[PDB]
């Protein structure tokens, strides 16, 4: 799924809408080295959180 909409309505006519695009399209703005280096730290954090 590319992106998801989230609309929610409230009393007194305060409605709102969010849109959540897939994380992947973010990672493609940045070069290789940064992505790979971020991946390592993520892995480490993952084990630590586990």
């Amino acid at each position: 799924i590319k992106a998801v909409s989230v609309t929610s309505f409230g009393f007194g006519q305060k409605g709102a809408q969010a849109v959540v695009v897939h994380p992947d399209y973010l990672f493609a703005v940045l070069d290789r080295s940064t992505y790979e280096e971020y991946a390592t730290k993520v892995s480490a954090r993952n084990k630590k959180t586990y």
Partner: protein, 147 residues
């Protein structure tokens, strides 16, 4: 000039917010709210105001009054809110569609609303935004501040 109907319905604090808003726009040289829509789109006239604990007169109604089963307005809970004031403002004056938000900083709530107003406007989300605070003094609030 608030019509007697609305007077009879809504929480007293809403009266205060309306009578404030009208002459605020007046102080801005605005006679009728719609004048904004001559220079800005409807979705760009927000209202980032909000109370600290507004509606106490209706919270009383729904909590301590109904328990006594005193004759109480049926839909009181729609006024017990805190965004319900800006609701009435938009319903009766602006009829706009700009960003409504509603801060609650109970004591320091009218200043944080201004921060919200700025993060709103500079974002381009809105070009005009009402911003302020309001609250009402009543019994159950005073007793607990005392204790």
């Amino acid at each position: 000039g608030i019509p007697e109907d609305t007077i009879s319905q809504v929480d007293p604090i809403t009266l205060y917010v309306l009578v404030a808003t009208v002459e605020a726009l007046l102080s801005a040289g605005i006679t009728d709210p719609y004048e904004f829509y001559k220079y800005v789109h409807v979705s760009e006239v927000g209202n980032c105001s909000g109370s600290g604990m507004g509606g106490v007169s209706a919270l009383r109604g729904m909590f301590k009054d109904r328990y006594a089963d005193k004759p109480v307005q049926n839909d009181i809970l729609q006024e017990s809110f805190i965004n319900t004031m800006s609701a009435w403002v938009n319903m009766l004056l602006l009829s706009s569609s700009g960003p409504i938000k509603t801060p609650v900083g109970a004591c320091a709530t009218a200043v944080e609303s201004v921060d919200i107003g700025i993060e709103t406007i500079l974002s381009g989300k809105a070009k005009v935004v009402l911003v302020g605070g309001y609250d009402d003094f009543q019994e159950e609030g005073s007793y607990e501040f005392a204790n």
